[PDB]
Amino acid sequence: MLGAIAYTGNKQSLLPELKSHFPKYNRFVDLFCGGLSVSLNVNGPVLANDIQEPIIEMYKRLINVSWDDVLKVIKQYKLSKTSKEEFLKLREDYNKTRDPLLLYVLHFHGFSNMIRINDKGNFTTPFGKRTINKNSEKRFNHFKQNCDKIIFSSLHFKDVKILDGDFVYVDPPYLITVADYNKFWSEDEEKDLLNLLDSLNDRGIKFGLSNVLEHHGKENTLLKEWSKKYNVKHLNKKYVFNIYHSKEKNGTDEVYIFN
DNA sequence: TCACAGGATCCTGTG
DNA sequence: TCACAGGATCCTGTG
Numbered sequence: 479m480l481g482a483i484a485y486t487g488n489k490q491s492l493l494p495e496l497k498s499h500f501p502k503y504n505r506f507v508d509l510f511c512g513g514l515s516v517s518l519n520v521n522g523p524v525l526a527n528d529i530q531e532p533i534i535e536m537y538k539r540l541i542n543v544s545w546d547d548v549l550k551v552i553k554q555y556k557l558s559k560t561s562k563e564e565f566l567k568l569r570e571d572y573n574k575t576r577d578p579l580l581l582y583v584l585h586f587h588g589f590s591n592m593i594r595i596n597d598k599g600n601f602t603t604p605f606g607k608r609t610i611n612k613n614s615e616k617r618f619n620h621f622k623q624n625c626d627k628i629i630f631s632s633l634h635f636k637d638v639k640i641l642d643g644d645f646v647y648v649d650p651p652y653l654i655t656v657a658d659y660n661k662f663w664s665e666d667e668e669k670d671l672l673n674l675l676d677s678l679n680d681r682g683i684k685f686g687l688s689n690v691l692e693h694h695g696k697e698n699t700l701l702k703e704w705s706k707k708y709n710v711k712h713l714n715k716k717y718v719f720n721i722y723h724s725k726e727k728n729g730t731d732e733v734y735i736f737n
Numbered sequence: 738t739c740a741c742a743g744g745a746t747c748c749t750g751t752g
Numbered sequence: 753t754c755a756c757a758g759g760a761t762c763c764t765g766t767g
């Protein structure tokens with residue numbers, strides 16, 4: 479199921495399997511919502527949270543615009559698969575005006591669609607030799623058809639209030655894989671998230687957590703130990719096949735850990 | 738005789 | 753991107 483935008487680490491292809499394991503709830507809390515692959519596709523009320531304010535503000539803005547507003551901008555900046563100089567201009571405009579619609583248009587044209595915003599709040603992703611495509615308006619339409627049930631927020635995961643009846647879904651930056659958002663992460667942040675999860679458990683609140691125990695030769699030892707206190711679902715089909723067929727090393731063990 | 742240039746080391750951020 | 757210039761500190765040497 480579609481996410482609002484292309485996004486490193488999105489859960490589009492895994493969502494059906496994940497919904498399999500979800501519990502019932504009064505409110506769905508997507509604590510690290512990212513590209514919104516989870517939030518757009520679960521029953522509301524939904525609280526979509528992400529520490530990257532510019533992206534959250536961009537979603538809040540999308541609610542009131544039409545695909546036509548997007549094309550007008552793309553037209554006025556004469557962007558294309560090869561408009562490197564035009565892309566730099568849009569980038570500067572987004573950086574001094576901070577209008578979220580521009581951030582939305584920029585993301586379609588940058589390096590691997592990455593949205594990188596530095597400390598000063600500027601977008602520094604280089605040109606990606608690309609522009610809108612078949613899925614652009616699709617993800618866009620899917621966002622419009624399902625954003626009603628969402629309340630957006632941009633707080634650090636531990637500063638979000640968790641209410642009884644909340645089903646907390648947690649898909650954070652993973653230490654052992656590669657993403658720009660990994661700059662907001664560390665062994666300490668992870669200890670904090672796992673303690674938070676344990677508390678939710680102490681309070682009888684259901685949670686679900688996405689991660690990887692092994693990737694390319696690296697393993698997350700503390701996460702493996704911690705996962706033994708809960709249910710564990712292995713999701714990478716290839717990883718599971720190879721496990722039964724006993725024949726390979728350095729695979730990606732994608733898991734879903736839950737109480 | 739304390740101001741300051743430049744070094745060293747670590748780490749951050751960009752193309 | 754994943755190299756790698758150059759911040760950020762703290763420190764050492766210089767007149």
Ligand SMILES: Nc1ncnc2c1ncn2[C@@H]1O[C@H](CSCC[C@H](N)C(=O)O)[C@@H](O)[C@H]1O
Nearest residue numbers: 488489510512513515529634635651659662
């Ligand atoms: N401390 C923190 N609190 C909340 N969100 C955080 C965070 N640190 C990083 N993030 C956010 O963690 C997200 C991990 S990626 C999650 C992707 C999402 N499930 C999808 O389908 O697109 C990123 O979007 C990042 O901005």
Ligand SMILES: [Ca+2]
Nearest residue numbers: 751752755756
């Ligand atoms: Ca370079």
Ligand SMILES: [Cl-]
Nearest residue numbers: 738739740767
């Ligand atoms: Cl003097």
Ligand SMILES: [Cl-]
Nearest residue numbers: 589604752753
């Ligand atoms: Cl490059």
Ligand SMILES: [Cl-]
Nearest residue numbers: 738739766767
């Ligand atoms: Cl002197």
